[PDB]
Each structure stands twice: as structure tokens, then as C-alpha cells.
Amino acid sequence: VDHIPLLRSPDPGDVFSGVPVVDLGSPGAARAVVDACERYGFFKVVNHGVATDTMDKAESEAVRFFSQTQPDKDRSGPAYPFGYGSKRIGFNGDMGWLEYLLLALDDASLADACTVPSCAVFRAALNEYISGVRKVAVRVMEAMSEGLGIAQADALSALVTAEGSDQVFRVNHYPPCRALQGLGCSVTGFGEHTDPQLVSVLRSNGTSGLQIALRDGQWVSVPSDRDSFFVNVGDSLQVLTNGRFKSVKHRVVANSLKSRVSFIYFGGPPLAQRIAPLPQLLGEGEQSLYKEFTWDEYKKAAYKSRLGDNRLAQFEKK
Amino acid sequence: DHIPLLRSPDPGDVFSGVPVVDLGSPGAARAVVDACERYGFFKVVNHGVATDTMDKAESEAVRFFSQTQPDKDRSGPAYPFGYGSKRIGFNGDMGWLEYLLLALDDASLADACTVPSCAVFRAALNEYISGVRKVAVRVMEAMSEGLGIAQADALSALVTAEGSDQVFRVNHYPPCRALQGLGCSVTGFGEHTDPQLVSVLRSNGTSGLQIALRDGQWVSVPSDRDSFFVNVGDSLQVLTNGRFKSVKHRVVANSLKSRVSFIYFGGPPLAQRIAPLPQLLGEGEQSLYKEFTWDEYKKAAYKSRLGDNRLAQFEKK
Amino acid sequence: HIPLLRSPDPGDVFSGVPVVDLGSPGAARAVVDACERYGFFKVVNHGVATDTMDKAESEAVRFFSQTQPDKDRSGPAYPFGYGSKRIGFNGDMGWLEYLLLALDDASLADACTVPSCAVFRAALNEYISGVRKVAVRVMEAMSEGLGIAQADALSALVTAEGSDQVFRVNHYPPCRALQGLGCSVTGFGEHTDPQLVSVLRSNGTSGLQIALRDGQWVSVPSDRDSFFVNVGDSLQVLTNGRFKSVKHRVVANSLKSRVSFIYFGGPPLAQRIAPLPQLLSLYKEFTWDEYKKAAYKSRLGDNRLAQFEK
Amino acid sequence: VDHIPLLRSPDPGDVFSGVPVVDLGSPGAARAVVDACERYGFFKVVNHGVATDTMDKAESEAVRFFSQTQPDKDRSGPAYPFGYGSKRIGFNGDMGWLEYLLLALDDASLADACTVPSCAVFRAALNEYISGVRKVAVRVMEAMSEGLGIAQADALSALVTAEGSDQVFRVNHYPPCRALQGLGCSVTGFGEHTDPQLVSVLRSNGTSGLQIALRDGQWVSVPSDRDSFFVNVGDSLQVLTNGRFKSVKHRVVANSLKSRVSFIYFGGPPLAQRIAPLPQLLGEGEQSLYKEFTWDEYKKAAYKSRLGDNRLAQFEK
Ligand SMILES: C=C1C[C@]23C[C@H]1CC[C@H]2[C@@]12CC[C@H](O)[C@@](C)(C(=O)O1)[C@H]2[C@@H]3C(=O)O
Ligand SMILES: C=C1C[C@]23C[C@H]1CC[C@H]2[C@@]12CC[C@H](O)[C@@](C)(C(=O)O1)[C@H]2[C@@H]3C(=O)O
Ligand SMILES: C=C1C[C@]23C[C@H]1CC[C@H]2[C@@]12CC[C@H](O)[C@@](C)(C(=O)O1)[C@H]2[C@@H]3C(=O)O
Ligand SMILES: C=C1C[C@]23C[C@H]1CC[C@H]2[C@@]12CC[C@H](O)[C@@](C)(C(=O)O1)[C@H]2[C@@H]3C(=O)O
Ligand SMILES: C=C1C[C@]23C[C@H]1CC[C@H]2[C@@]12CC[C@H](O)[C@@](C)(C(=O)O1)[C@H]2[C@@H]3C(=O)O
Ligand SMILES: C=C1C[C@]23C[C@H]1CC[C@H]2[C@@]12CC[C@H](O)[C@@](C)(C(=O)O1)[C@H]2[C@@H]3C(=O)O
Ligand SMILES: O=C(O)CCC(=O)C(=O)O
Ligand SMILES: O=C(O)CCC(=O)C(=O)O
Ligand SMILES: O=C(O)CCC(=O)C(=O)O
Ligand SMILES: O=C(O)CCC(=O)C(=O)O
């Protein structure tokens, strides 16, 4: 369904030093979160308390899995409802220079229904990491509701701690494209998009590749940092804040010399959840910018769409 | 990769013992229980769905499938809903078919299921759907009656509950001109049992449907565009601790005429625990099955190949 | 895709292929009768030793036994070499793999570097020498049977220097998908051969079929000890339509492996091709180079002889 | 291979400014030709006596043919032994971003057996151009011999004017690649190779694309010049000069914005011709670097190879 798109190779003039940095354990974190979410939809989290040991072991097990042979990996595929995938992203023809694991959580662990990966050592290293990253996600969302003045402390966080939360966990591997070294153009690792749910929390190895789109349309590279997290505002959080936090549009450009390995936690609510601006955030007679929908509805619409589509616009008011 | 071939079926394979259930008769409950215990399959006559409703749904489907392939492909692919061609599920199964896979709310097309977009086709489907869903409820009440369950809705409540996972599928098996008169036929839909509770099929007059009898022989079901054919699915085999056996069935494409099929699949809500109804568990009787939710069964189903024995991994030692 | 075919039913085995005993009087009359009535005949008592056929076969069996990666090194098949499934240039396909090889006189051309194995090349070359002698004797028998005093009137076209002779080794492996289904896969789709004659030998496996004049398709029983000879289009023209070229095809055997050797006797490229003077034209003037290049612009099943008819 | 390789988009620093230029109507031509053939294997030819008019009409008629629809073009397909081709180059998987005509020549014009193209106007325009460029090839080969100090003035030119010489004529079309505008990388129009014959003579429209490898391996861009010819030493001329003239390795980098149309005459000898150093160029005792072979052998070994292969190596001692 067409090939992987090419992109102009990123400059070093494209690097972005202004990514906001949030010390979760700290005073003024709640305000730094709000500010970053308002102007970028994206920020780095440090001193998050997830051990570098568990991050390193999750990565090592992932690298081991992806180093298997293509037929051995294909036994865990395809990626839907869960499992291993190669190049194809979603259902509608998108492709990237990547391979990945798309996995399902129950609360703070892999779901037992999600039988990939089968190797107990990989599964156990993933589960320790997932526990850690899920607590960071909850803390980020409490810092959100706090910096937004929400008395209810779990106003956001409770949507992913609820029973039957739709929480997704994805391991991406962008191998090197050696065919393109020095040629001025680079292959898309993961085409541009916004994430559909509340928040995503990413951790990578040290290889570059992640880019975000600024408000003025410009694409900038985010320097990688294997010991910190990067947090995305997703479309659903754009709606719960009535447009105050805009979803960050982001993509991955594959490196032509080093493998890039990423772990991403996606916080989504239960399927039945009605997604609308939090009553607490609407002023007197303020109108929602959005039609009413449920998460199940948004998610299904999402899977009928292309990666780069503006999925929110179909649910915006006219 | 490629669509399997099969021995063309000849009149020697026709099966005359398909149980008949007269849905308006008070003997339906006993016929249904008997058929579910012997074949997992039965025809349903005198069902109250008008032939004009069936005709107009079929006519609108045929028109959709007559569209060019680029035009159909715009309603594709088939997941989470929509149009599909040849590929069945996610794991390489293929058949000489195209189809629509549609989602329901209660007894109509779900608003979120945007396919088909054409309001005439949608209206005809919604009329047919309303009728067949009523047939399925009646069938399931007859089953519970014939099983001796006090609660009349012991089964039917599972597809009428809020958040029911009910699927509606339109299958088109077109002619295969190339195989005309060659002694072999292309697979229309590979062999499988259905995962949920009950399936209710109606087709146009074309042959193709086959079922496997308990001894494994494949026999052809005579088509009847005016009746329904009901399948026991894996989840109902579990609710009856093995009493009702899921029917294995397939479609062999006809090399001469289109076969157009409508199928309603009755599933429960995703969170339903699937286990032997406690009413059907004698004294000390042990369930043959591990406990599981419909969500779990369905997720494991989509990880499997069409012909896999999906129940096997949920059976006890 | 590879076209499927109705499986051949024993009903259509043809027992009446003419038999030409090459060491018997009246070989000449039998040869000519079969070239007129069928375009096709069996050749027995031909002098090629059983031993030289079996060694050609087993070395070819050995070659096809290699891995697909190793066989692909000798491919694809043009201007010579190994091919798989694709026949010609215009999308024809069959369930087969093969070697198409070029001959210098009665041997594999040194320029034809496939196959590389010396053992295999030896067996082929000894086989090729035998069958080419059989081809010459067969063409000499046709001139005798036509009342032509020059007994090399046909033979000379393939003994000339620069004669264009091709040799192919076909392998039709089993098709397990189809066993006992009543439909068989095409091993090699219907065609007439463009040259003067072709001389075929196979192992015992069924699969060769010819079209009778009608033309119903009938199965020819295999016979590993004998050759089967086709009239090709060029020989139809050299006889102004008296021998019509046989239309033939191969239907792969779903259980069995069929291995074939075919020599194709063509003239030199410069050869002007017309009814032999001794036998007098329905055909336009053309050279073998012309017919060959036009043949390669066509599909297997095309009537290549029409665009050269009046 | 199945992908068309990409290459760095050529910058202005890659522009070769010193392509050798040969005034064909000049007495110094012969010295300039030998120097260029030894040092670059490539030179430009000006003041060549082919009318701008002749070139324009062949070009417009080729543009007309290529603007035909794909189904209509494909009926002159495929390209072997003669005809139309798209993307695929030769037999062994090479691909470029182009379509083309591969045509056979007889004497000074299109061979009648090469039925493509059908349109007598195209054919007529092509034959006028072909007559012009073949005479340029003959004059070039005459200047080569004069400059080697060979007495017999047709010692090279006679191999292509001879009866049954294997001359080939190719019309290449490199359409734009809009998908890559501004991305810094370009798509391969025609992969690197040397030509197997004696000489090749090329003329294009004004769109860039042609690049050659210098002796030190650097790839440089050749400025396009729609009114001049560019001449390549081929592998066979390397053998007839005993290694003195080295065949130029070259390629085309498709322009992403504009269409590039090319004609190329390939001067080869008759198939039976023994290819070896010209007697005159071996001083007593001097050893030929090459096994003995015939054009037919070299040409067939060439078609068994891949485009970038060093075809000359297997025929070295
Ligand atoms: C075409 C796609 C691919 C989607 C769904 C749809 C649009 C949005 C994409 C993502 C983007 C974010 C998450 O990785 C994901 C798992 C998610 O939730 O949305 C993606 C999902 C997928 O890759 O399968
Ligand atoms: C068992 C399931 C669950 C499916 C459908 C079927 C197989 C594929 C699954 C997904 C996976 C991707 C999307 O979330 C989804 C909405 C989709 O489109 O496909 C899923 C859908 C569901 O969870 O309801
Ligand atoms: C390989 C497949 C194809 C499945 C899923 C999985 C196993 C069972 C199949 C069916 C069988 C019955 C229904 O048609 C269906 C919609 C259903 O519910 O189960 C099918 C579903 C699909 O086509 O998407
Ligand atoms: C479509 C094809 C395939 C041709 C060329 C063209 C038409 C005639 C075919 C044969 C038919 C007979 C010989 O096998 C053959 C080697 C031959 O000489 O002619 C074939 C050749 C080829 O396979 O390369
Ligand atoms: C080096 C050669 C020799 C070719 C062209 C090119 C590659 C393919 C060869 C053939 C092979 C098949 C036909 O005989 C032919 C006439 C044809 O069409 O292709 C051949 C042609 C030739 O011998 O003149
Ligand atoms: C891979 C290829 C493509 C070849 C044959 C083989 C090796 C050399 C190539 C050229 C290169 C020069 C001419 O364009 C050509 C027509 C020629 O004479 O040789 C090419 C030929 C072809 O395209 O058919
Ligand atoms: O893998 C990465 O580094 C980011 C990819 C991404 O944004 C996603 O998978 O939604
Ligand atoms: O389409 C038909 O006729 C029956 C196919 C079937 O049984 C199914 O899709 O589950
Ligand atoms: O004997 C065989 O199987 C091949 C006969 C044939 O049809 C051919 O390839 O020309
Ligand atoms: O087509 C061009 O412009 C040059 C390509 C070339 O040299 C060739 O096709 O051999």
C-alpha cells in the first residue's frame, strides 16, 4: 500500500533545546506541566523515580527479541489485536521503517490475554518497567489537574486507573537504514500524527529520531535522553481541557546508522467513558468546542483513519 | 498466500436431514434442543420476517457489490468495520469472497459504524437487522425453554443486554468463471466454528454452504432463500457444558452464480464470564472448560487461524 | 497466475500415436503418414543407449535437487540458463522449472556456460549427440518418404554451420495442493513449436498431451525408452502445409515428478524459409531470424504462423 | 532487486567543467579524441553536421509516443528482442525511473523486422536522426584511428558499417519524480554501467541527468547540451585498443522536476566478429590483455550479467 515516505534529513539547525523539563518530585512541577502542555503539548520528565536498572533490562530484552530472525519474530505477529508488527502501521496503508510490539495492559501489568511476548524473562522485564511508567503517568496527570486548579486530585488520573481502562503499551524498533547514509534524505520511522488518548509517556535509548511540530508548523528534533521520559498531550486530553492543551504532532525519522528503541505507554480511559471538557474547567456559560463522543467511538474512528489525519476535526463543533 | 481448492460438491453430498424448527409452533423448544444436541445446526421456518424485507436487503447488497472495486475499496478495509475482499481475519486466511463486516447497537446498525454510507442501503439493512435479531431472541428463548430453564431469557438476555457484542456480516461469493467445468471449486469461506453464542444466516438461492456431521463427513445444505439457518457457536457449547456442539461449516463457491449471505452473530458483552449455566450443572458435575470472558475468547479468536479449534485451549485437562 | 486445467481422465488416453521403427523398412512411409495425420509420432529402435539417457536424467535430477538460491545463480533463462515458472517474455507461466541451452553442432556451445558442473555437461553432451543423430535420421526419413532425391534436403538445415538448435530440460515437480481434486495445474501451456522438428524424451511420468485435428485434447502415454517427435511451424512451411505442426501442452502430475529433454532443430538465422522447391506457396517470404524474433514477441498459445500467411 | 536505488541529489560542486570537447570538422579532432578516450572514455562532439531540425523532430515524435497511455505503450512491449519497456533494465532485476524504446538497426536505419514503433511519422523522424548520428559515429571512429597512427582509415569504422553489424538504438524517457522534490535525494534513472559495444553516441534534451565516473571514482555531472553529442568508449573498444581507451562508467540521475529524453546509438560489430587488439597497435611481442572472444559471446555474457557488473573482467587474462 505505497512505500515508506521519505523526508528531508534533519539538520542540526533543527535541534530544539527549549523542550520544557519537569521535575515531578518538586515544587512548581504542576505549574511547569500546565505551561508546557499549553505551548507545546509535550515535555520531558526527570527525577521520576523509575530505576535505570529496570529501564536498561527492558531495553536489553527488547533488543534481544528484535535481533531474532524475521521468521522467528513473525510467529508473534501480526500486531492486532496484539503482537508483533513490521512496517505496517494501522489498517489503512501507513508504513514506516520500523518493527514493533503492540501490547495490552490490565491495570499496571501486561494483560494475561496479551500472550506476546511469550518468553517469561522479557515479560517480567516489561512488567517491571510498565509498573514504573504507569505510576509516572498517574503523577503527571495529578500534576495536570493540580496546575489547572482542580480540587479533585484524581480528576484526570482516575480515567486510566479505572477498571477497564484502555491502556496500550508499544515497543518500537527503528533499525538503521544503511542504504540512505549521506544521501540527504531520510526514511520515515513513524509518520506524523497526534496520539488519540489522554497521555503518552515515551522512553527511548540514546539514538535520535523523535521530532515534534511547533505551533508555527516547523518540525524540530528532540534530543534523546535514555534516562528521562517524554510526555505527549493526546487528543482526548485536548478535549477534556476544551482546547487549552493542544495535542502534540510528532513523528520519528529513522537514523541511518544506529537502532532506535522506544517504549511508549498510552493512557486511555475505559471504552464507555464520555469524553468532554471537565465541568470544572468550563467557565460560566462556556461552550464545548467538541461534539459529544465516547472513547470507544473515537478509537474506532481513529482506526478507520490515516496516521496523519486530523482525527479531532470530525468531532469539532461547526 | 492463495485460496485453497476443494473437490467440487456433487449431488451425492446433499443432506436431507437438516432439522426444521417451526418458530411459531409450541414444539419448537424440543426440536431446537434436539437439533443443537445432534448437529449444532437447524433451519428455522415460519419466522415472521417478511420476504420483502429480505429481498430489499439482498437487492441493496447486490448493488453495492456491483460497484467498481475502487469504489468498494473506499469503504474498506473491514476492521474495525467496513468492506473486505478475499482476506478473512488477520492471519492469512483467504476465500473467494468480498464482504461487509458491520457493528450493531441493540437491533440496528451502530451510528459509529459508518459503512455503508448510502442511506437507502442502510435503511434496508436496518429493517432486515431488526427482523433477524427478533428471530435470534425467539430461537434463544426456545433453547432455554427446551432445556428446562425457568428464566425465559437465560440466553436471550445475553444478546439484548447493553453493550452486546453483536456482529452483522454480508458475504458475496461471486462466480469463478475460470473454474467453470474443471472438476474443482474454490473455497468461499474456509471451515470454522463460530465463536459466539448463535449465528443466524439467510442466503439467496445459491448453493455453497456445507456443514460437518459428527463423523466428520462434509454434506451440502440445500439453500432456501426464505428460511434461516442457525449455528450453535463455541460460547453456547460452553454455556451447556458440552451438550450443544458448535457446528463446523464452510462455504464452497459456485463457479456459475453469486451467493449472497446475511449473517447475524449473537455475542454477549465483552465482560460476560462464559461458563456452564449453573442450571445445567447436575450434582457435582464439573465444567469441561476453563473460566473466561467473551473479550478473552474473542481476542484469542482473532489471534487464531479460521480453522483452528479455538475451544481446545479453553478446555480443562 | 498459472492456469488450471481439468484433470486428464483415463478416458482420453490416445493409443494411436504412430510408431516409427527407425531400423525397419518403410520407416519413411510411416514417418510421412504420421506427419500428415497428427504432426506427431513415436520413434523406437533409435540407437541411443538406455545408459546415456539415465545419466543425463540423473544429473538433471541432481541439478534440480539443489536449493532455489543455488539454482537461481544460473538464471534467469535468457539468452540461456535456468528458469522457473515464467515461459517466454509475455507473461506465460507454468508449473515447471527448466534449463534452456544453446548448441554448437552436436554439443553444448562453449558460450553456453550453464550448466557449470563438468559431470552434468558431459552427460548432456553425450545425450545431445545421440538425439541429434536421431533428429537427422528422422529428417532423412521424411525426405525419402516425400520422394526427394536429395536425402539431406531437410537434414542440411540443422547440420549447416550456424544452425540455430536449442535444447531444454523441463522439470514438472509435484503439486501437492491439488492431489486428488479433479483439477490439475498447467505444466506448460498449449503451443506449436516454431522450428522444423523437436525430439522429446521423458521419464515415465504422464503429462504430455496433443490436440488432434478436431481438435480434442488427448493424453500420450509416456515411454522413457523412446522419443516423440513434433512437426514444428517451419516444417509446415517447408512442406507448404502438408505437415501441420502439432499443438501440444503438458499437464503437471500432482503426485509425480516429470523430467523431459527436448531438442529443437532449427536452421541458421539467415535461412530463407519457404516451401521446398521439390514439393510444388501459402506463406509470405521470411527468414528464421524473422520468425524467431516475431515468436518471442508473442504469447505461447498464439498462432504464430498466421502473421506469415497470405 | 525490486526497489529503484536512490542517490544523493547532485549539487553544483559536482558539475564537471572540463568535459573534453571535440570539433569534428577540425584537424586536431583526432588528437583530442585519443586524449579524451584515454583519460575520460568520454567526450562531447560539436560542429557535427546533424541539423537541430532533425533532432527536434525525432524528439517531438518520441514525446508523442510516450504521452500515449500506458495500455497503448504496453502493446509495443515488452522490450526484448525489440520494443517498449518501463523501469526494468535487462534480465537480472535492474530497475530505473524511466521508460524506453529498444530498437534494432539495419544498415543506416531502422530494421524492418523491428516492427516498433508502428507510426510511419515516428519511424521517418527516427530514420533521419539515425542516419545523422551513425555518420557521426563513423567520423568519430575515423578520428580515433587517425590519432592512434593507424594507416587504414576505416580500421575502426568498418566494424559498424559492415554488413550484419549489430547496431542498437535506444530512446530513453526519464519522467519527473514529483514525490522527491526538495528532499535532497534523487532516484536512479539508469544505473551505473559501461557500454559493451565499441562506441555509443548520445543526444538529449536540455534536462540534466547524465553523470560519469572519473578515473579516481568520483561521480560528476555532465552539463546537458541539446545541440551536441556525447560519446562513450565501450568495452569492445577497450579490447581493440589493448586497454589504452578505457570504457566510461556512467549513469543517469533522474531530475525530479523535468522530463529528460535521450537518444543513444550503440555501434557494435557483426556477431561473428572476433574482438581483439588491432594488429597495428601491438608492437612486436606486446601481449593482448584479453582472452579471445566474439561479439555474440560478449553480448550474451553481458545479458547474463547485472548492469553494474564489470563485464570485461571475465574476459581478462
Ligand atoms: C492508523 C492508526 C495507527 C494508530 C491508530 C490509527 C491512528 C492513530 C495510531 C496510533 C498512534 C499512537 C499509538 O501508537 C496507537 C496504538 C494509537 O492508539 O493511535 C497508534 C495506532 C496504531 O499504530 O495501531
Ligand atoms: C477482537 C477484536 C478487537 C478489535 C476487533 C477484533 C480484532 C481487532 C481488534 C482491534 C484492534 C485495533 C482497534 O482498537 C480496534 C477497534 C480495531 O479496529 O481492531 C480493535 C477491536 C476492538 O478491540 O474492539
Ligand atoms: C480468522 C478469524 C476470522 C474470524 C475471526 C477469526 C476466527 C473466527 C472468525 C469468525 C467466524 C464467524 C464470523 O464471521 C466472524 C466475524 C467471527 O466472529 O468469527 C469471523 C471473524 C472475522 O472474519 O473477522
Ligand atoms: C512464448 C514463447 C516461449 C517460446 C518463445 C515464445 C513462443 C514459442 C515458445 C517456444 C516453444 C518451443 C520451445 O520450447 C521454445 C524454446 C521455442 O523455441 O519456442 C519456446 C520459447 C521459450 O520458451 O523460450
Ligand atoms: C544478446 C541477445 C540475443 C537475444 C537478444 C539479446 C538477449 C536475448 C536474446 C534472445 C533470446 C530469444 C530469441 O532468440 C531472441 C531473438 C530474443 O528475442 O531474445 C534472442 C536475441 C538474439 O539472439 O538475437
Ligand atoms: C543489464 C543489462 C542491460 C544491458 C544488457 C545488460 C548489460 C548491459 C546493458 C546495456 C548497456 C548499453 C545499452 O543501453 C544496452 C542496450 C546494451 O547494449 O548493454 C544495455 C542492455 C539492455 O538494456 O538491454
Ligand atoms: O517510537 C517512538 O520513538 C515514537 C513513536 C510514536 O509516536 C507512536 O508510536 O505513537
Ligand atoms: O456466507 C455464508 O454463506 C456463510 C459464511 C459463514 O459461515 C461465516 O462468515 O461465519
Ligand atoms: O515434455 C515436456 O514435459 C515438455 C514439452 C513442451 O511442451 C515444451 O516445453 O516445448
Ligand atoms: O539515457 C541517457 O540519457 C543515458 C543512459 C545510458 O547511457 C544508457 O541507457 O546506456
Numbering used by the authors:
A (entry chain B): 10 to 327
B (entry chain C): 11 to 327
C (entry chain D): 12 to 291, 297 to 326
D (entry chain A): 10 to 326
From the paper:
Here, we determined an X-ray crystal structure and performed functional analyses of two rice 2ODD family enzymes, OsGA2ox3 and OsDAO, which catabolize plant growth hormones GA4 and IAA, respectively. Both enzymes formed tetramers for OsGA2ox3, and dimers for OsDAO with the aid of their substrates, thereby enhancing their activity, as schematically summarized in Fig. 5c. With increasing substrate concentration, the enzyme gradually forms a multimer with the aid of the substrate itself (effecter), thereby resulting in an increase in enzymatic activity and in the active catabolism of GA or IAA to maintain hormonal homeostasis. The results revealed that a monomer–multimer switching occurs based on a substrate level, and that the resulting conformational change enhances the activities of these enzymes to maintain phytohormone homeostasis, in full agreement with the allosteric theory by Monod and co-workers.
GA 2-oxidase 3 (GA2ox3) is a member of the 2-oxoglutarate (2OG)- and Fe (II)-dependent dioxygenase (2ODD) enzyme family that requires 2OG and molecular oxygen as co-substrates, and ferrous iron Fe(II) as a co-factor, to inactivate biologically active GA4. We crystallized the enzyme with the co-substrates, 2OG and GA4 in the absence Fe(II) to prevent its enzymatic action and determined its structure via X-ray crystallography at a resolution of 2.15 Å. The crystallized protein consisted of a homotetramer (see below), whose each subunits with a common core fold in 2ODD enzyme family. As the location of amino acid residues in OsGA2ox3 interacting with Fe(II) are the same as that reported for other 2ODD enzymes, and Fe(II) was absent from crystalized OsGA2ox3, we located Fe(II) at the same position. While GA4 interacted with non-conserved amino acids, such as Q206, Y312, Y89, Y109, and R179, among 2ODD enzymes (green characters in Fig. 2b and green closed triangle in Supplementary Fig. 3). Additionally, GA4 also interacted with 2OG located at the bottom of the active-site cavity. K313 in subunit A directly interacted with P87 and F91 in subunit D by a hydrogen bond, and vice versa. In contrast, peak T corresponding to the tetramer appeared in the presence of GA4 (GA2ox3 + GA4), confirming that tetramerization was induced by the presence of GA4.
